[PDB]
Design an enzyme around this catalytic site. Sequence first.
Site, PDB file in Angstrom:
ATOM      1  N   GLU B  65      21.750 -25.199 -10.320  1.00  0.00           N
ATOM      2  CA  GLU B  65      22.206 -25.527 -11.674  1.00  0.00           C
ATOM      3  C   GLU B  65      23.119 -26.757 -11.647  1.00  0.00           C
ATOM      4  O   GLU B  65      23.011 -27.665 -12.504  1.00  0.00           O
ATOM      5  CB  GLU B  65      22.931 -24.349 -12.286  1.00  0.00           C
ATOM      6  CG  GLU B  65      23.276 -24.575 -13.729  1.00  0.00           C
ATOM      7  CD  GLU B  65      24.271 -23.564 -14.254  1.00  0.00           C
ATOM      8  OE1 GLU B  65      25.382 -23.518 -13.664  1.00  0.00           O
ATOM      9  OE2 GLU B  65      23.955 -22.852 -15.265  1.00  0.00           O
ATOM     10  N   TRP B  87      18.542 -20.241 -17.448  1.00  0.00           N
ATOM     11  CA  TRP B  87      18.482 -20.870 -18.761  1.00  0.00           C
ATOM     12  C   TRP B  87      17.199 -20.612 -19.534  1.00  0.00           C
ATOM     13  O   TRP B  87      17.018 -21.121 -20.644  1.00  0.00           O
ATOM     14  CB  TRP B  87      18.722 -22.375 -18.629  1.00  0.00           C
ATOM     15  CG  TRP B  87      20.105 -22.715 -18.316  1.00  0.00           C
ATOM     16  CD1 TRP B  87      20.676 -22.781 -17.092  1.00  0.00           C
ATOM     17  CD2 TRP B  87      21.125 -23.069 -19.265  1.00  0.00           C
ATOM     18  NE1 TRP B  87      21.987 -23.179 -17.204  1.00  0.00           N
ATOM     19  CE2 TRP B  87      22.299 -23.351 -18.525  1.00  0.00           C
ATOM     20  CE3 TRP B  87      21.158 -23.162 -20.667  1.00  0.00           C
ATOM     21  CZ2 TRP B  87      23.516 -23.753 -19.134  1.00  0.00           C
ATOM     22  CZ3 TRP B  87      22.406 -23.598 -21.302  1.00  0.00           C
ATOM     23  CH2 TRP B  87      23.551 -23.870 -20.521  1.00  0.00           C
ATOM     24  N   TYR B 113      25.413 -29.344 -21.087  1.00  0.00           N
ATOM     25  CA  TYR B 113      26.360 -29.913 -20.150  1.00  0.00           C
ATOM     26  C   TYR B 113      25.897 -31.231 -19.544  1.00  0.00           C
ATOM     27  O   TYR B 113      26.617 -32.226 -19.594  1.00  0.00           O
ATOM     28  CB  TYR B 113      26.657 -28.946 -19.008  1.00  0.00           C
ATOM     29  CG  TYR B 113      27.267 -27.659 -19.431  1.00  0.00           C
ATOM     30  CD1 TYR B 113      28.610 -27.569 -19.735  1.00  0.00           C
ATOM     31  CD2 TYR B 113      26.495 -26.512 -19.545  1.00  0.00           C
ATOM     32  CE1 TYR B 113      29.165 -26.378 -20.145  1.00  0.00           C
ATOM     33  CE2 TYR B 113      27.059 -25.335 -19.979  1.00  0.00           C
ATOM     34  CZ  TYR B 113      28.418 -25.309 -20.262  1.00  0.00           C
ATOM     35  OH  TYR B 113      28.981 -24.142 -20.663  1.00  0.00           O
ATOM     36  N   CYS B 173      30.623 -23.482 -22.692  1.00  0.00           N
ATOM     37  CA  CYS B 173      31.794 -22.607 -22.356  1.00  0.00           C
ATOM     38  C   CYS B 173      32.818 -23.297 -21.460  1.00  0.00           C
ATOM     39  O   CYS B 173      34.012 -23.145 -21.669  1.00  0.00           O
ATOM     40  CB  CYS B 173      31.394 -21.309 -21.639  1.00  0.00           C
ATOM     41  SG  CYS B 173      30.463 -20.352 -22.821  1.00  0.00           S
ATOM     42  N   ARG B 193      36.716 -22.111 -22.499  1.00  0.00           N
ATOM     43  CA  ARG B 193      37.047 -21.479 -23.838  1.00  0.00           C
ATOM     44  C   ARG B 193      36.735 -20.017 -23.927  1.00  0.00           C
ATOM     45  O   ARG B 193      37.397 -19.300 -24.656  1.00  0.00           O
ATOM     46  CB  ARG B 193      36.367 -22.217 -25.008  1.00  0.00           C
ATOM     47  CG  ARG B 193      34.870 -21.939 -25.130  1.00  0.00           C
ATOM     48  CD  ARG B 193      34.141 -22.581 -26.266  1.00  0.00           C
ATOM     49  NE  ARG B 193      32.673 -22.357 -26.167  1.00  0.00           N
ATOM     50  CZ  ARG B 193      32.064 -21.193 -26.388  1.00  0.00           C
ATOM     51  NH1 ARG B 193      32.747 -20.159 -26.781  1.00  0.00           N
ATOM     52  NH2 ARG B 193      30.745 -21.056 -26.233  1.00  0.00           N
ATOM     53  N   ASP B 196      33.340 -14.509 -19.480  1.00  0.00           N
ATOM     54  CA  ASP B 196      32.900 -13.155 -19.175  1.00  0.00           C
ATOM     55  C   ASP B 196      33.327 -12.871 -17.724  1.00  0.00           C
ATOM     56  O   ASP B 196      32.742 -13.402 -16.763  1.00  0.00           O
ATOM     57  CB  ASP B 196      31.379 -13.102 -19.305  1.00  0.00           C
ATOM     58  CG  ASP B 196      30.781 -11.776 -18.775  1.00  0.00           C
ATOM     59  OD1 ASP B 196      31.516 -10.987 -18.156  1.00  0.00           O
ATOM     60  OD2 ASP B 196      29.602 -11.509 -19.074  1.00  0.00           O
TER      61      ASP B 196
HETATM   62  O1  LIG Z   1      29.073 -20.399 -18.017  1.00  0.00           O
HETATM   63  C1  LIG Z   1      29.321 -19.417 -18.732  1.00  0.00           C
HETATM   64  C2  LIG Z   1      28.565 -19.280 -19.911  1.00  0.00           C
HETATM   65  C3  LIG Z   1      28.789 -18.176 -20.744  1.00  0.00           C
HETATM   66  N1  LIG Z   1      29.760 -17.311 -20.383  1.00  0.00           N
HETATM   67  C4  LIG Z   1      29.961 -16.144 -21.196  1.00  0.00           C
HETATM   68  C5  LIG Z   1      31.199 -16.130 -22.034  1.00  0.00           C
HETATM   69  C6  LIG Z   1      30.661 -15.235 -23.181  1.00  0.00           C
HETATM   70  O2  LIG Z   1      30.651 -13.837 -22.810  1.00  0.00           O
HETATM   71  C7  LIG Z   1      29.262 -15.670 -23.398  1.00  0.00           C
HETATM   72  C8  LIG Z   1      29.059 -16.834 -24.399  1.00  0.00           C
HETATM   73  O3  LIG Z   1      29.323 -16.466 -25.747  1.00  0.00           O
HETATM   74  P1  LIG Z   1      30.329 -17.274 -26.781  1.00  0.00           P
HETATM   75  O4  LIG Z   1      31.708 -17.299 -26.214  1.00  0.00           O
HETATM   76  O5  LIG Z   1      29.632 -18.594 -27.089  1.00  0.00           O
HETATM   77  O6  LIG Z   1      30.317 -16.326 -27.975  1.00  0.00           O
HETATM   78  O7  LIG Z   1      28.877 -16.129 -22.098  1.00  0.00           O
HETATM   79  C9  LIG Z   1      30.449 -17.468 -19.210  1.00  0.00           C
HETATM   80  O8  LIG Z   1      31.327 -16.634 -18.923  1.00  0.00           O
HETATM   81  N2  LIG Z   1      30.246 -18.504 -18.417  1.00  0.00           N
END
Ligand SMILES: O=c1ccn([C@H]2C[C@H](O)[C@@H](COP(=O)(O)O)O2)c(=O)[nH]1
Lengths: 284, 288
Positions: B65, B87, B113, B173, B193, B196
């Site tokens: 990636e 993706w 990105y 994110c 921002r 998870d």
């Molecule tokens: O690189 C990444 C991409 C996504 N997320 C997680 C954060 C969120 O749980 C979800 C994206 O949802 P939003 O915050 O856009 O609602 O994916 C990550 O942790 N890392």
Amino acid sequence: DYVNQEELNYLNQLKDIIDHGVRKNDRTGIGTLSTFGTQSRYCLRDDIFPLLTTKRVFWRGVVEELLWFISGSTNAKQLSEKNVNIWDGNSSREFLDSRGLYNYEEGDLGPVYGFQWRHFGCPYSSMTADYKGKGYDQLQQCIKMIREEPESRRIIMTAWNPCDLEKVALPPCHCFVQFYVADGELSCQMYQRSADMGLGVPFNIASYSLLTRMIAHITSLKPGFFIHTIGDAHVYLTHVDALKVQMERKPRPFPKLKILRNVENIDDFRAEDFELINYKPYPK
Amino acid sequence: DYVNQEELNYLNQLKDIIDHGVRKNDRTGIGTLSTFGTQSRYCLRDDIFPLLTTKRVFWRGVVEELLWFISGSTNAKQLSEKNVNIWDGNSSREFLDSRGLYNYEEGDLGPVYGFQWRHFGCPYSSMTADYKGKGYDQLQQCIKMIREEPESRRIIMTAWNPCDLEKVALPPCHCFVQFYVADGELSCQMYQRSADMGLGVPFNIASYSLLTRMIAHITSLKPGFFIHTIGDAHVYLTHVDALKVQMERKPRPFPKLKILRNVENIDDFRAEDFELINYKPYPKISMP
Ligand SMILES: O=c1ccn([C@H]2C[C@H](O)[C@@H](COP(=O)(O)O)O2)c(=O)[nH]1
Ligand SMILES: O=c1ccn([C@H]2C[C@H](O)[C@@H](COP(=O)(O)O)O2)c(=O)[nH]1
């Protein structure tokens, strides 16, 4: 025995930079002591307002600059005419020429904070053009998202547009802002790429905390935290002696801040709407 | 024995969100437990590489990636051909119709990105348009500044363009990146921002740590720190029992990462350039 834990942390952060920060040059060949990557939290509950007590902060400047940013203006004369001269040095004929901005008139900073906040992505011509309805109004979009989708993890306002770097008198320091809502409280995180801990940081904390209160007011939320995150956190070598003296001082309790009117929207705020209660700094 | 403090800190942050996080529903309809505003530091000295050991992280995915981000591509099929399918969900005919991107062909992610890194501010049409030399090449500009002006406090790479938000399936994110050089060592801070903590963070840490290693390598610097700053740090409620398991595991020492040849520029790396030494993870953990 009252302890202002938040201000004490700030003092400890100065000490840590002074004692253990690495020597670094700034872009003028002047020296700093620096660390990379810091994060500090300021609680906004109960109207408590993180204006630093160990050296007086220019609150009238914080308020007027911020209302000027929110207006979308890029004309430092509009601040200067309110007896706030903080942007005068970077908008002089001479400074603008040194930046290659030969066609800007005096006062024209180019597309700095207020333009990015309210008109992101609009082509800049000058400070006198009407940009109403043009670009992306990020500030209003954040407010809409707060009210319509408070759970959202995408409530962001950026001040960083690399395409605009050659048009600006100086590149943005307070770069990126995010808002968050939980349990009826509004929080804000701001990312600052470069922070002078002595002279810049205290004023910065106050601007963003105050923006947080403003937005919580017109979105019907209670205030939570302001989170300040820094890239290059530094102190200038020539300041080190004065900051050592400041560090001997015992912080006092933070003032409170009340909003005195039911303000219509983010553009309707006026300097007299804010009352700072019991701010009692040491000198400076 | 050896104590992996950085991995213990991650596990402690998991514990904290699980025990003290605010319940917050979210866009997905699953609920989360959530905290706002965290910061963690990972030391990259002595080739040590913060790939988590209390579960097997998808290393091959991280590498492919990132090489694909670096290429500036926005076509998920270029990644899928590397048997990395992460993706594909967000670029199916079906899924794009839902975000109202009826004119994108399958695989077209919009200006995600890689486009933002290599071509910021260029108008996006489709994944098959020629963007070469259009927009602002932030990644190469950061590289140049690290080489020419290492002391600068302005070495920034943004992925956030409000004008592009309606053109992508999901807004970036990992939004904002700053590089820093001191005493011959390169560090990187990345602002996320939305994180998870189960499924995303371990991968995300590995991604930026690897980017930091790559740039350090082509600029003849030593790697310093990766600093990870998060806005909304969350655990999905459905993940909690599985994260409970993970939290009882004893972290092992991190692996080392070696780069196996001399690479001169950022676009010249291949997957086989990277060698993980002594990665000894516990088994993978599945989470909805
Ligand atoms: O690189 C990444 C991409 C996504 N997320 C997680 C954060 C969120 O749980 C979800 C994206 O949802 P939003 O915050 O856009 O609602 O994916 C990550 O942790 N890392
Ligand atoms: O709001 C601001 C603006 C600037 N500075 C300081 C940080 C640096 O010391 C200097 C800006 O120089 P560069 O980071 O752009 O070199 O001003 C602040 O602390 N706060």
